Structure to design on (272 residues):
């Protein structure tokens, strides 16, 4: 390890203290936790995520999250989270376990963090190091275009990569994002994404689709499909890599079969 990082060993749990919280909307939040010292950084390679874990209702619960902060930040880590409230959706009366646990924490409370984890690492300037599985060394490749399909909270792994590319004036990679959600209200981090589109149009293409469309809507409506893939993601080729993160059903039934029909091979698609 070159820098003074927090995630020194992936097999260790680090209890971090909650020091700030922001109400983004009725069901969205930003939670900020302190690192071991004001001079520490998290130590999370681009492409990887951390896990939070705690005991809830007498059972151990573990869930993955990709922070919105970066290794440029000293002393804290920021998470943006959608809270799934109980007795709000007829199909899920109990709501979400970890997201409700976070919403119920008091400033000063701690929660376990672990990482970095994930089979893909972006090394910059279009280079991606990917492991076939946890027991293999990574194979490196270079691409010119990165396609991205996110559904709901799956936007954070994409935003982390987008920002790493754009922060580097000399990175020529172009990112194409197709962001899908249940309704316009559920579009997480829209202001942040549109600020990036206005400042870096040449290296970032943005498009949305929603299941429930508002009367005034300029984008697509419906599940991710063949037409959307052809019109808003780069064409198949060795110079293209497609990244995906979203609900299992969306990835399995809406993404994979249409990517196949369009010509994107599985050796050139990765799911976070
Ligand atoms: C690499 C990666 C990065 C991620 N990063 C983030 C992130 O930055 N921020 C983030 O918020 N999440 C993120 N997620 C996803 C998130 O890990 C988990 O699904 C999440 O917080 C769900 O936890 P839960 O324990 O709260 O819900 P659980 O208890 O797991 O699940 C309930 C399930 O039922 C449904 N459900 C329950 N209640 C409701 C309700 N009221 N309305 C609608 N549907 C409902 C949902 O489909 C949900 O997944 C990431 C996932 C991956 C794989």
């Amino acid at each position: 390890h070159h820098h003074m990082i927090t995630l020194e060993n992936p097999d260790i749990k680090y209890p971090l203290r909650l020091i700030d919280k922001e109400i983004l909307s009725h069901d969205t939040r930003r939670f900020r936790f302190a690192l071991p010292s004001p001079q520490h950084i998290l130590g999370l390679p681009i492409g990887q995520h951390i896990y939070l874990s705690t005991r809830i209702d007498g059972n151990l619960v573990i869930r993955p999250y990709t922070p919105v902060s970066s290794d440029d930040d000293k002393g804290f880590v920021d998470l943006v989270v959608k809270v799934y409230f109980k007795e709000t959706h007829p199909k899920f009366p109990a709501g979400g376990k970890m997201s409700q646990y976070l919403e119920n924490m008091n400033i000063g409370d701690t929660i376990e963090f672990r990482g970095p984890n994930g089979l893909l690492v972006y090394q910059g300037k279009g280079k991606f190091a990917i492991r076939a599985d946890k027991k293999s060394n990574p194979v490196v490749r270079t691409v010119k275009s990165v396609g991205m399909i996110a559904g709901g909270t799956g936007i954070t792994p994409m935003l982390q990569v987008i920002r790493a590319v754009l922060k580097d004036p000399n990175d020529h990679t172009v990112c194409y994002l197709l962001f899908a959600n249940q309704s316009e209200k559920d579009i997480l981090l829209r202001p942040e994404l549109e600020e990036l589109r206005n400042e870096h149009s040449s290296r970032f293409k943005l498009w949305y689709t929603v299941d429930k469309a508002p009367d005034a809507w300029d984008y697509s409506q419906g599940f991710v499909n063949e037409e959307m893939i052809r019109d808003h993601l780069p064409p198949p080729g060795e110079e293209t890599l497609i990244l995906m993160c979203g609900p299992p059903p969306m990835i399995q039934f809406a993404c994979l079969p249409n990517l196949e029909r369009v010509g994107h091979p599985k050796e050139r698609c990765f799911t976070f």
Notes: The chain has two domains: 12-117, 118-272. The two ends are 25 Å apart (CA to CA). Residues 179 and 208 are 5 Å apart (CA to CA). The pocket of flavin-adenine dinucleotide is lined by residues 49, 63-66, 79-82, 84-85, 88-89, 92, 95-99, 153, 156-157, 245, 272 (CB under 6 Å).
